[PDB]
């Protein structure tokens with residue numbers, strides 16, 4: 001019991017196929033599967049399964065020297081055959097990985113020997129190693145657990161080289177993990193971790209208070225923020241709030257009336273009292289966001305001009321673009337048509353509902369009629385893929401995704417960001433520059449390109465940045481300080497030390 005912990009997650013961890021997406025949970029995939037190279041807090045990668053690498057002048061050709069002491073948790077060796085088999089299994093599903101540009105860059109992968117793995121690329125793709133460090137999909141299952149020599153159609157046992165092993169999984173109840181006693185690296189202090197399936201935020205908070213669970217770790221939706229604050233004050237409990245990890249924002253549809261109008265999007269960026277929204281819906285626990293990426297994100301310190309909360313300026317912009325108040329209605333019209341904007345969100349999510357109503361109230365004050373469209377997850381996702389939205393809640397991806405991979409993704413037609421940007425005349429140019437920036441090794445041209453991309457996106461008011469949000473922890477005191485993992489979607493259980 002003293003080196004075993006119980007914690008919670010909103011759904012099961014999934015089958016833990018290392019190469020597929022939802023319902024697999026990334027943090028669980030990272031507990032079982034490892035990358036060639038490991039991301040660090042400081043933005044670099046260090047050696048991991050690969051102990052060294054070289055790259056051609058090219059540098060389109062890469063040669064990794066792997067550790068020779070690693071075994072999958074079932075005793076089978078990790079070597080360059082296994083690695084290459086994994087990359088093949090991922091790339092037989094190439095289409096599915098379209099959002100990750102490394103998947104389109106990989107041209108060939110080949111085991112030169114047990115300890116040498118060669119990977120060759122379409123281009124001198126700068127973010128190569130960071131993308132290899134990601135939870136998915138470039139991590140390694142024992143080949144012997146492939147189904148008919150593929151992973152794309154399912155796996156057998158989810159055997160990784162990772163510091164944790166999936167002991168047991170009860171659909172809709174729990175998942176139990178156990179420390180890998182034959183890990184190649186440092187042994188975790190925790191021996192057993194039990195994940196209780198609890199989808200309701202307030203039910204999570206209760207399970208903590210009653211003592212049923214020892215740990216909660218998540219983003220701003222981990223538990224009600226008012227309860228979180230009450231906890232921070234009670235010495236019976238332990239709580240933490242990290243520094244911001246990523247951005248929460250609306251995406252505005254530049255291709256759909258009335259948000260197709262620059263002037264309208266500029267006003268919207270002046271209408272919301274952000275600090276009050278945070279103080280009112282997020283119990284004062286998050287930070288205001290003025291730009292797509294916080295100035296602390298790499299390449300993102302551009303001196304971009306915030307739009308402060310300024311109702312009067314929002315009105316003026318509206319009036320000048322011809323969106324005026326009829327007698328005696330509170331909602332602007334121009335040319336027949338009322339200033340009506342649909343804001344869609346997952347309607348079961350109380351926090352999203354909560355922020356939307358505030359957004360709705362603030363924009364009413366400047367003569368914008370926002371109708372709330374709260375729908376189930378899938379509908380929201382289909383609107384995202386389709387561009388069937390005026391405004392949609394959205395969020396950046398945290399490190400190491402931010403900003404390169406988030407920017408990379410704007411190019412993919414089925415993503416909310418591509419759809420929002422469709423109305424821009426500059427859209428092809430941006431997508432071209434996103435492509436160039438990812439292959440640039442002139443370091444000054446790289447800065448210049450990100451500058452152009454982010455600036456164009458800022459000045460077009462594609463987004464309405466709301467908050468830079470944080471990770472948060474609630475824990476039994478006996479567990480000690482809980483660390484944060486470099487990768488925002490990972491959970492560093494192996495650094496927990498009672």
Ligand SMILES: O=C(O)CN(CCN(CC(=O)O)Cc1ccccc1O)Cc1ccccc1
Pocket residue numbers: 021022026099136397398401415416489
């Ligand atoms: O899924 C990933 O590995 C990472 N995701 C890659 C893209 N996703 C692919 C998919 O989910 O199929 C699709 C996706 C698109 C837009 C928003 C979120 C999404 O998951 C990005 C991500 C990073 C951190 C946290 C959440 C999502």
Ligand SMILES: [O-][O-]
Pocket residue numbers: 021
């Ligand atoms: O992908 O979450």
Ligand SMILES: [Cl-]
Pocket residue numbers: none
């Ligand atoms: Cl070593």
Ligand SMILES: [Cl-]
Pocket residue numbers: 439440441442
């Ligand atoms: Cl170059």
Ligand SMILES: [Fe+3]
Pocket residue numbers: none
């Ligand atoms: Fe994803």
